[PDB]
Design a protein around this ligand. Structure first.
Ligand SMILES: COc1c(C)cnc(CSc2nc3cc4c(cc3[nH]2)CCN4)c1C
Ligand SMILES: [Mg+2]
Ligand SMILES: [Zn+2]
Length: 313
């Protein structure tokens, strides 16, 4: 009960900042996550023994892929931690419990391939889950691990609270399907301007949590430039392998996944910041003003990609 996780001074201070990088020491990531759960939720939210066993089973069910790996899971959880800590009073006890777990689990058993590749390959998961294929898989994996003996971190919840938190997690994980982000942000943009946005309306909260999940999932674009640039290398390592596998099926991949179009990456990134990232953090900042540092960091990185194109780097 009295056992706190502590971090070295530099990590203790920087972990509170949106642009924190969790570092290259994999063995510290579980402790970083438990630290964030303790400060965000409470030292009593989870039985420490069950939490530690949950964390290690989740880690084991992430694969050795360049980007959609265990580091991404903990990185996405840290961005959610930073949102929750800067918006202390806006979220329920169940939501803070659920969302850190949802973020840690949101890409469970990812193979390094898009929903589109699974469909074109005719992968079994594409038959089981016609839409948001991988995201329904990630939620399935989350429930499977929760049901292992000694892993039910939610055991001390009542039946209705347990059903509520699993529903928060399901919606949160499905929301990481970027195909669904565009419509979700459009609806939130309309509701915020016409002034009809109401955080007591459950279907409105779901939308806002949806946007928070997209914002955490894309948080690579909100880091300092050297982190953003080096993370991009891992993203393209995965995408270009998928493009290769598309060519193996006799399908020309979209240029984003084609290693032969490396040269156009800087222009591709501009389109991504202008079409996805900036709008995402703009709407989030309008709904949750204290998340503004994410938007500022994103605009800084858009400026860096513009400098790459102009040959200044
Ligand atoms: C996972 O989200 C991210 C993040 C965080 C950063 N970067 C990206 C890549 S966005 C993107 N990269 C591209 C490269 C090329 C084209 C379009 C692109 N769109 C046409 C020519 N080549 C994604 C998808
Ligand atoms: Mg995903
Ligand atoms: Zn993800």
């Amino acid at each position: 009960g009295l056992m706190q996780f502590t971090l070295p001074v530099r990590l203790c201070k920087e972990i509170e900042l949106f642009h924190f990088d969790i570092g290259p020491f994999e063995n510290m990531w579980p402790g970083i996550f438990v630290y964030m759960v303790h400060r965000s939720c409470g030292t009593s939210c989870f039985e420490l023994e069950k939490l530690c066993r949950f964390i290690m089973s989740v880690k084991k069910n992430y694969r050795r892929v360049p980007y959609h790996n265990w580091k991404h899971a903990v990185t996405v959880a840290h961005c959610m931690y930073a949102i929750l800590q800067n918006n202390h009073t806006l979220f329920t006890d169940l939501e803070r419990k659920g969302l850190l777990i949802a973020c840690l689990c949101h890409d469970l058993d990812h193979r390094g391939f898009s929903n589109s590749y699974l469909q074109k390959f005719d992968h079994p998961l594409a038959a089981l889950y016609s839409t948001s294929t991988m995201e329904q898989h990630h939620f399935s994996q989350t429930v499977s691990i929760l049901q292992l003996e000694g892993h039910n971190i939610f055991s001390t919840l009542s039946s209705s609270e347990y059903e509520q938190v699993l529903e928060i997690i399901r919606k949160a994980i499905i929301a990481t399907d970027l195909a669904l982000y565009f419509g979700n942000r459009k609806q939130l943009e309309e509701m915020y301007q016409t002034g009809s946005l109401n955080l007591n309306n459950q279907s409105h909260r779901d939308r806002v949590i949806g946007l928070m999940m997209t914002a955490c999932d894309l948080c690579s674009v909100t880091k300092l430039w050297p982190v953003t640039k080096l993370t991009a290398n891992d993203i393209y390592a995965e995408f270009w392998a998928e493009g290769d596998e598309m060519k193996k099926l006799g399908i020309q991949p979209i240029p984003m996944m084609d290693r032969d179009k490396k040269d156009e990456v800087p222009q591709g990134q501009l389109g991504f910041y202008n079409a996805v990232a900036i709008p995402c953090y703009t709407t989030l900042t309008q709904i949750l003003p204290p998340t503004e540092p994410l938007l500022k960091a994103c605009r800084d990185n858009l400026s860096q990609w513009e400098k790459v194109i102009r040959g200044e780097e």
